[PDB]
Amino acid sequence: GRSRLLEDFRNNRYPNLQLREIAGHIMEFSQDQHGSRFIQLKLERATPAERQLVFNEILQAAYQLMVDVFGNYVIQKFFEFGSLEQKLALAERIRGHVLSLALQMYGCRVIQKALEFIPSDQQNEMVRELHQHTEQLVQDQYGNYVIQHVLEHGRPEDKSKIVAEIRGNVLVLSQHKFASNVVEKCVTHASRTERAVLIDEVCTMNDGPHSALYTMMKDQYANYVVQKMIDVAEPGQRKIVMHELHQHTEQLVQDQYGNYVIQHVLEHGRPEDKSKIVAEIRGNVLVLSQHKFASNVVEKCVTHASRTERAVLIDEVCTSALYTMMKDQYANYVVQKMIDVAEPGQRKIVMHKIRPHIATLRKYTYGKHILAKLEKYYMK
């Protein structure tokens, strides 16, 4: 059913086609996978008159195109390169349907592009329609992305309304697959008072099987919220959060999701918190390096601990444990990190233990990675 023009374009018959040559076929091209991309790349360098001619053929079906798999990109580009009254015309079609679009797969991207390029007075009239269903949007598969956009670029009063909607549900929404992204953006972009209240909510003692903080640290989605809370919490609330983390470090370094929080503390935390984590895995480097989840924790300890702590962690393996670790799929990366970070006096000891197995390492998958990394310092 395609026109001969669109079929020729898809078959690469017109290498230098222009927007003027597809007049009368803009709707057909916008709904085609390759024709839509043609309008996109051309929409950025055409005169406003040429854009207006393209805009004329899609105005009546603009609301249809906003949810189309391929036509929505043409609507997005008109927000990114169209004139003022064109964006006001597109925004007028969205008025009354902001909720319906924000919940759609491609409509949520049209809503984001709209709030990004339309004047502020139209952003306000559009974001006020979002505040009516904030609780519904933060948990939606696509509505949460619109709420995140307001938390990153909206007005502080708009962010306060979103924070107030999250208040009292911080624990539950942190564990939600999509609301966790919204809760994290609140901790990042709310005021220091608002985010201190949100952090304080999960710092309260509850009667649940685990504390609110410990439950979040081991949760699939809420642990990403804990990491952001650790970054921004004031020293008072920070000591409370880190205290709960230290009480469960042994389980967290091996948990499927808790190990990420431990890694975050090792990368960005205070040296005192890093030292207590190093002290916990100290004595178990061999076992934890072969663990599918705890191996990345041990690797971060070798990378971020102090020189004296690294010396003890590295010497613990040298007294063989290195052979078992080089043959392991997870512990292999721990050995390579130890070679890079060890002081030259201790690196000689590590390379002296790897030396008897050099001829056998090439059989293992990562043995090449070990030999190529040994070549950087061995006998140099």
Maximum distance among all alpha carbons in the chain?
A: 79
In a domain, 376, yes or no: yes
Tokens of 295: 């191996």
**Helix (H/G/I), strand (E/B), else coil: 118:** coil
Q: What CATH number did the domain enclosing 359 receive?
A: 1.25.10.10
Taking the C-alpha atoms of residue 147 and residue 160, their distance in angstroms, rounded to an integer, is 12
Taking the C-alpha atoms of residue 97 and residue 366, their distance in angstroms, rounded to an integer, is 55
Q: At what angle do helices 179-189 and 143-153 cross, to 10 degrees?
A: 0
Instruction: Please tell me the total count of domains within the chain.
Output: 1
Taking the C-alpha atoms of residue 362 and residue 369, their distance in angstroms, rounded to an integer, is 9
Tokens of 264: 């975050």
In a domain, 16, yes or no: no
In a domain, 282, yes or no: yes
Angle at 232 between CA 235 and CA 144, to 5 degrees: 150
CB 203 within 8 A of CB 213: yes
Taking the C-alpha atoms of residue 268 and residue 303, their distance in angstroms, rounded to an integer, is 12
Residue 338 lies in domain: 248-380
Q: At what angle do helices 33-43 and 71-81 cross, to 10 degrees?
A: 0
Give the residue among 183, 164, 267 at the shortest CA–CA distance from 224: 183
Taking the C-alpha atoms of residue 223 and residue 260, their distance in angstroms, rounded to an integer, is 8
In a domain, 61, yes or no: no
In a domain, 142, yes or no: no
Structure-solving method: X-ray
Classify residue 265 by burial, with Cβ atoms within 10 Å: 0-12, 13-18, 19+: buried
Give the residue among 147, 216, 210, 153 at the shortest CA–CA distance from 178: 147
In a domain, 203, yes or no: no
Give the residue among 293, 234, 237, 284 at the shortest CA–CA distance from 263: 293
Sign, CA dihedral 205-206-210-214, equals negative
Burial 268-286 (b: 16+ CB within 10 A, else e): ebeeebbbbbbebbeebbb
In a domain, 169, yes or no: no
The residue assigned the tokens 């036509």 is: 71
Run of H or E residues at 113: helix 107-117
The residue assigned the tokens 């040298």 is: 318
In a domain, 110, yes or no: no
Resolution in A: 2.5
Classify residue 50 by burial, with Cβ atoms within 10 Å: 0-12, 13-18, 19+: middle
Give 115-119's long-range contacts (Cβ < 8 A, gap of 24+): 115/146, 115/149, 115/150, 115/153, 115/154, 116/79, 116/149, 116/153, 117/79, 117/80, 117/87, 118/79, 118/87, 118/88, 118/91, 119/84
**Helix (H/G/I), strand (E/B), else coil: 145:** helix
Angle at 313 between CA 307 and CA 316, to 5 degrees: 135
Q: What is the DSSP string of 283-349?
A: T-HHHHHTSTTTHHHHHHHHHHS-HHHHHHHHHHHH--HHHHHHHSTTHHHHHHHHHHHS-HHHHHH
Instruction: Give, in order, the Cα–Cα distances in Å from 184 to each of 125, 175, 179, 257, 278.
Output: 26, 11, 9, 16, 27
